[PDB]
Design a protein around this ligand. Structure first.
Ligand SMILES: *[C@@H]1O[C@H](CO)[C@@H](O[C@@H]2O[C@H](CO)[C@@H](O)[C@H](O)[C@H]2NC(C)=O)[C@H](O)[C@H]1NC(C)=O
Lengths: 50, 49
C-alpha cells in the first residue's frame, strides 16, 4: 500500500514499505589548503696570492 | 739590489632567502539545490565571496 504523496521538487515519489524516510537534506562542505615553501642559499669566495 | 712583493686578496659572499605562503578556505552551505551548493561552495580563489 503506502501511496502517501512524497515530493522532491516537482517530482513525486512512492516510498518503499521498508524505508522510513528518504529526504533531500542538502549540504555541502568545500575545503582548500595550499602551502608553498621556498628556500635558497648561495655561497661564494674569491681568493688570490701573488 | 733586491726586491720583494706579496699580494693577497680574500672576498666572501653569502646570500639566502625563503618564502612561506599558506592559503586556506572552507566555504560551507546548508540547503538549496545540490548543484548550486557544489558550484557555490567551490572556492573561486579570485572571488572568495
Ligand atoms: C669572483 O670573481 C668574479 C669575476 O670578477 C665575480 O663575478 C663578476 O662580478 C662582477 C661584479 O659583480 C661582474 O661585473 C662580472 O660580470 C662577474 N663575472 C663573472 C664571470 O661572474 C664574482 O662575483 C666573484 N665572487 C666573489 C665571491 O668574490
Amino acid at each position: 500500500g503506502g501511496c502517501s504523496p512524497h515530493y522532491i521538487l516537482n517530482t513525486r515519489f512512492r516510498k518503499p514499505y521498508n524505508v522510513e524516510s528518504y529526504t533531500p537534506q542538502t549540504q555541502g562542505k568545500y575545503e582548500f589548503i595550499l602551502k608553498e615553501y621556498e628556500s635558497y642559499s648561495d655561497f661564494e669566495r674569491n681568493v688570490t696570492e701573488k | 739590489s733586491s726586491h720583494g712583493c706579496k699580494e693577497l686578496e680574500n672576498a666572501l659572499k653569502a646570500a639566502s632567502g625563503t618564502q612561506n605562503n599558506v592559503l586556506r578556505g572552507e566555504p560551507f552551505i546548508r540547503g538549496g539545490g545540490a548543484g548550486f551548493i557544489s558550484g557555490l561552495s567551490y572556492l573561486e580563489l579570485d572571488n572568495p565571496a
